[PDB]
Design a protein around this ligand. Sequence first.
Ligand code: HEM
Ligand code: HEM
Lengths: 83, 83
Amino acid sequence: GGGARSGDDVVAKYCNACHGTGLLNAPKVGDSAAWKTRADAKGGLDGLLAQSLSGLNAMPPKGTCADCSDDELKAAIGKMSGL
Amino acid sequence: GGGARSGDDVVAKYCNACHGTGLLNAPKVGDSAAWKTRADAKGGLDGLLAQSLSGLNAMPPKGTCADCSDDELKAAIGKMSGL
Ligand code: HEM
Ligand code: HEM
């Protein structure tokens, strides 16, 4: 989605590992549906990002790339998601 | 290893998911070696526990079972490990 670094670059270098396959029940990429009821649950594109940073269960905290700015985490959420 | 609940119970209900297979490069169960150079690196059985709680990379924080006392986390470390 957006742009810090990518999400193209970010999904592929960090996010890939679970979201690609669906490993651990990771909401898979392009799966507009799954991601939707999610935003729903946490009030938009900020409930996923505020969510990734914190982490949830088996989803490791901060998406990962403990390097990432907040803008990148959202761009890789933007593009795992659809929106 | 030790006893809060188990680690038998704990490894099997929470820890299983990655350490069983080796999913995500999770140091597998019984693998005395792998776990050893680990304790080494973080000064004993407290560098894994202080470690799990915090989490590291793809290892989700607090082993998981965000329920667990510290004594259980160590007993499931005791028994993933060998020691
Ligand atoms: C890459 C930095 C990355 C981001 C960003 C990210 C985000 C993310 C969101 C927003 C969710 C939904 C959380 C919610 O419902 O609020 C989510 C869910 C899971 N993720 Fe993730 N995720 C990124 C990458 C990774 C990686 C590399 C892993 C595997 C170690 C992983 C795993 C998961 C899992 C599992 C879930 C579902 C967890 C659950 O909802 O029970 N993600 N992720
Ligand atoms: C169950 C509550 C559980 C515990 C406890 C636990 C501990 C643990 C330790 C001590 C390490 C070594 C960390 C270090 O080197 O200091 C470790 C490593 C990894 N784990 Fe784990 N772990 C438990 C369970 C789980 C589960 C359910 C997952 C999968 C979502 C998982 C994953 C991993 C991974 C991956 C690693 C290696 C991470 C890395 O060292 O790069 N663990 N765990």
